[PDB]
Each structure stands twice: as structure tokens, then as C-alpha cells.
Symmetry: C3
């Protein structure tokens, strides 16, 4: 039993429910639970597919702002960025297909999690985005590398620099999700997909997943290293401290370079 | 010279019709014919563009699964995969533009053939997919590498793991075809494109085609090799045998790997 | 050096640059120098946080400048002009501040190559976007052969270059060649609203985003740009290239030998 993830297996499908009330923030503990889920999924021969969704209104609204306050320093910040990067690389490397079922919102760290899953389905009105620059920070869980490789460099640029999220319907247009389903049947419609996948032989599922990883170049991996380093730098900068303080104080930050 | 392809040159457009009854399956002999067609195209100064289409219902419904059952060892299955891979690479490397005109369906090996062409046009209702996993197999003619580079790895994953084809209209949305035409004037509309292309200088068409190949990395090429290796292993596995036997006998396979 | 065919105003930390090389905003060598100066200015000025580039008159830019590609120009000079454009456009893409192209009317050939070198693009629904160089028996020489397929996919890029037919702004949005389309009546203003959102961000995070986005270009993209300039020169002095350009200047269809 994991603290913020509950898992129920039915017909070789592990349905994992993220439950870190009220917005399912990707805290350090949740990351540990994610790594444990992937370990469990990889060892259980009965499990052929995993579907991940959020409890409550949201898939996941972000990383946990409580771990990024004034009390945290630059080395811990780089390390926290790297914990999310490592965790989400474990998800993406999972030998069993992992589907993110998104309703409500997947923002920031939450979208970075979803992005590391092999497939995503969303409701039409779900909000997907990377609003980290509102805090004077950058995405630090590989979002700067994953997002442009989904939606292209230009859209990714716009989404990061404006911080504005896009709807599930728009994310479909831009290739950030696989498909949209109605809110009423959304989890069930995603489970239908999982059930089709569960019918295929494990060795072929594994093979497809492996062969899909060839787009992860050494330029990609070095980008992820760079992102973690930059994250720590901006985090401890005057502008990064101000951005985070402004958010907590419900005011518009003032950046000075 | 060419058994299951016939080529007619009119107004600098080579129209190649694939006709390998019943389903235009991509057999070893077909591969040979395609290689010859490409050498012919490159060497005939009168040819400026090639349009490839299927005789009958389909562009091509897949590899020749009957011919697959002549295989008794992994190495032979890997060799058959490599033959397709080599054949389609010769297509993609062709110094004259090659258009696939898809009506009805392009599935499995047939989609892999179309994907090696420079451009693709389709009818709204055509079915395009990679259903090899229904056979306990994977795509082995570079489909694992080409498909995600068209539609994105998420959509490619869904396509391969579910085996469900997408329509021509959907393939357009996902970037797997260039365009869709009405089913009544489909081949005429594709030929209008080819005629526009035939108006350009041969050295410029060759230059454009060369310059487009920079999108293929070492990871792509290594991926193709790995795909061939995996293909042969899954082919002679119990589940591979079962899936092929089940398809041939028109029943649902029973996987237990 | 005052800018010759560019003008720049700065408001709310947004440098608004207007290309004005009448009548079609052709990307001449002088225009390239102006663009390089703009990027130089923008990178030096801590007060500028974002750039929006648009065209004066009917077009963003209708092409490179035909006056530099006549029978009097030889091969070495043609390759060097291709290289000028490529290097200028790489300066734009490598800019440490966000650059937005706001396209109305048309962005064609060298003009689209320019717009493609910017980080984002917005267009009107009826703007024409394309690479029509093969009409002249030439190829795109300002990195279009490498940038275009990385926006729209190799298949669509192939079709655009081989047919020379432009696509609409609305189609360009579908194919990922622009970020968005706005109404022709509020077009520049709608683009400036985006610029203003971006100018609210810390300069270090904006720089970091841009740098981290560079990783999408392979070593083969860079080799490809160099090969493109090499081919451009060869085709430029070839019988077919000389004929495409002469036919264009004479307002007739070209007839090509091979």
C-alpha cells in the first residue's frame, strides 16, 4: 500500500488513483509512490496495462509549492528537479503501457507527469499547461524537452512564455493528447482502450514501447541535464525568489533581471 | 521484368499499379518488383514523378502472411523483415518524387510501403493502420520507426498496441497523409499534384529530396535494425506462432507469453 | 548605420519592427544587414524583452530579392548570398529574447524563411505561406529546406516545395507552421497582446526557455543547411537555374532541360 496512490487491478489493468487532496500535487512523496507503482507494475505478470488518473477535480495541478519556498536552497532545488526527471523517465521506460487519463487539469509538474506516460486521454475542457514562468521559474521535470517534442518548438515556446494552458480539445489538435472523451464516461472510455491493449502479447507490447524510445536522442538527454542546472540557478535568483513569494502572497511579481 | 507491378509513363508521370491478388500483399516478389521500379524511375530521363496505387479494393492489406509461414527459424524471419526495410529505404531514397495514392486500405506492410513514399494522398474513408500485434508480431518493415515520426509517438503507440486503423480523414489530422480527396476523383486529383511536380527541374526535385533526408538520424537507422531483430524473435515464439496460425484460421488467438 | 529598410519602436518592453523594402519587402542583402542590426540592438538593450516583426504594406515578405539573382551574378556569389540569409536567420533563431513574426498578406520564399527563423508566428486566415523557389529552377537557400519539414513534417514540406503552391494562414495553423490566426482587423494588436504576456516574464526564464528549445535541432539539420547552400550555388549557375530566373523576369513559364 502506497500513501497517495491506490491501485486496483481488474482484467490485467492496474487502475492507479492519485489522491493527494485537493489538487494532487507532485510532491516528493508522490514521486516516490510513482516509482513504487512502476516497480510493482513491472514485477506483476498479471498486469499488462496501467491507467493513471486523479482523485477529485484534477489529474494534477502542479509540483508542490511547499517544497519550493524561501527555506529551500539551490542544491536541494536542482535535486528536486532531478527527482521528478528521474521519476518520469522511470514511467516512460516502463515495460508495460502506461496511460494518463486526464480530467480537470494537468498543469506544470502534473503535465510533466502526464507527458511521461506513453499515452494521454483528456476531457474536452481539461486544462493542460506549463505555467512555471508565472513563478519566475522554468519547468524542471523535463517539461522543456518533452513538450516541444509533442506540440512542436513554436507552440511549446508560446505555452511556456505565456503560461496560458490549452484545453483538452486543443491539446488533441496539437498532439499533446491521444484523444478526448466525454466527462460522463471518461474513465470508462479510457479503460476500453486499456482492455484492447491488454489483449496483445506482452513481448510485443514491450517491443513497441522499446522501439518508440529511439526519438530520445543524446541532445534530448543533455537538454534534461541542462534544464535541471538552469532550474536551480533561476530558483535561487532574485527574480525566482520574487516570483514564488508573489504567488504565495497573491500579488503580481516584479522582475528586475 | 516486374511481376506484380505495372508502370505506364505519360506526360513524365510514371503511374505504377500494384496488383498482387487478392489484397496486394507485400511479398518477397513484390519487394523485388519495387526495387526494379525505383531503378527504372531513376534512370529513365522521361520520368519526373511516380504515382503508386493499388489495383482493386486496397492499396495493400499487409505483408504476405502466407509467405511468412514458410519460415522455420528466427534468422529467416529477420531476413524477410530486412528485405522489406531495404526495399522501402530505396523508395524513400529515390531521387525522383514518389507519391502513394491510397484508396480502401493501407494496413501493416502496406502502410509501411506507403510511409516510405515521399508523399501520400488518401480517400476520407480509407483505413490506415499497423495491426501486426493482432498476429503476435510487430511491424518489421520500419513501421515502428516511421509511424511515430509522422503521427507522434503517443498516437503511434495507441495504433500499434490497439491495432485499430484510422480513417483517411484522421490520418490527415495526424500528419500521416498530405491530403484527402473525394473518392470519385481521387486518382485524378492526385495526378494533378504529380503534374505540378513534373513541371520542376529534375536537379531541384533531386536536391529537395536529398535535403529532406536529414530528418533521419542514426537512432532511426539503429531502430530499424533492432526492429528486424525483434521481429524474428517474436515470429518464432509460441505467441507469434499462435497469432499467425489464428489469423490464418480466422479465429482469435490465445496468447500466454 | 541607421537601419535602411527596417524601423523599430519600443513600447512596454516590446520592440516592434516593421520591414519596409518596397514594394514586396524582399529580403535583400541590405535587409539582412538591417535584421542583424536589429538582433544586435535587441540583445544589447535590457529594456527590450520581446520582439514583434511585421511587414509594411501588402505583405510580410514576398521573397528574396530577384535583383541579386540575375545572369550578372556568378556561383560563388550565389552561395555566399544563400549563406548570408542562413547566417542572418540563425541569428534571429538564436536571439536571447523571444521573436514573434506577425504575418499578413503573404510570407513567400525568403520571406517565409525569415518568418520561420522567428520563435513564434501568428497570421491572418487568408495570408499565403509557401516556398515557391523551384518555379525559378532554384531551391530555398535560406534554410527553408531544413526548417519547413521540422514545422509541417517532411511529407507536407515536400509537397509545398515541389508544387510551389502556398498554403493559407488557416492551413498553416493546422500544419503547425504558425501558432495561431487572428482577424485581419485586429491582427497586429492581437499579436501584441501575446507579446505583452511574454514581456511579463523574467528575462532569465525567457532566455532559458529559448536555449532549452534549441535541443530539437540535430547535427544533421546543421549539415543540411550547409549542403543547401552548396546545392543552391550549383543550381543557380546551371542551365536550368539560369532559365528559371530568366523566364521569371520575362513573365513566362520556364522550360527545363535537366
Amino acid at each position: 500500500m502506497l500513501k497517495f496512490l491506490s491501485v486496483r487491478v481488474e482484467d490485467h489493468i492496474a487502475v492507479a488513483t492519485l489522491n493527494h487532496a485537493p489538487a494532487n500535487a507532485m510532491s516528493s512523496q508522490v514521486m516516490h509512490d510513482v516509482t513504487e507503482l512502476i516497480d510493482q507494475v513491472e514485477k506483476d505478470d498479471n498486469i499488462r496495462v496501467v491507467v493513471i488518473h486523479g482523485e477529485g477535480r484534477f489529474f494534477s495541478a502542479g509540483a508542490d509549492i511547499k517544497e519550493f519556498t524561501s527555506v529551500t536552497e539551490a542544491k536541494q532545488a536542482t535535486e528536486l528537479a532531478q527527482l521528478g526527471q528521474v521519476t518520469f523517465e522511470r514511467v516512460e521506460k516502463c515495460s508495460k503501457p502506461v496511460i494518463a487519463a486526464i480530467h480537470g487539469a494537468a498543469l506544470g509538474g502534473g503535465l510533466e507527469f502526464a507527458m511521461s506516460c506513453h499515452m494521454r486521454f483528456a476531457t474536452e475542457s481539461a486544462k493542460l499547461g506549463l505555467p512555471e514562468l508565472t513563478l519566475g521559474l522554468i519547468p524542471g521535470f523535463a517539461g522543456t524537452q518533452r513538450l516541444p517534442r509533442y506540440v512542436g518548438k513554436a507552440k511549446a515556446c508560446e505555452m511556456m512564455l505565456t503560461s496560458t494552458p490549452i484545453t483538452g480539445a486543443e491539446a488533441l489538435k496539437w498532439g499533446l493528447v491521444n484523444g478526448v472523451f466525454a466527462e460522463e464516461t471518461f474513465l470508462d472510455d479510457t479503460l476500453k482502450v486499456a482492455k484492447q491493449i491488454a489483449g496483445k502479447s506482452p513481448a510485443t507490447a514491450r517491443a513497441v514501447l522499446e522501439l518508440l524510445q529511439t526519438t530520445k536522442s543524446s541532445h534530448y538527454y543533455e537538454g534534461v541535464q541542462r534544464e535541471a542546472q538552469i532550474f536551480g540557478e533561476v530558483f535561487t535568483s532574485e527574480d525566482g525568489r520574487e516570483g514564488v513569494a508573489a504567488f504565495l502572497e497573491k500579488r503580481k511579481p516584479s522582475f528586475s533581471g
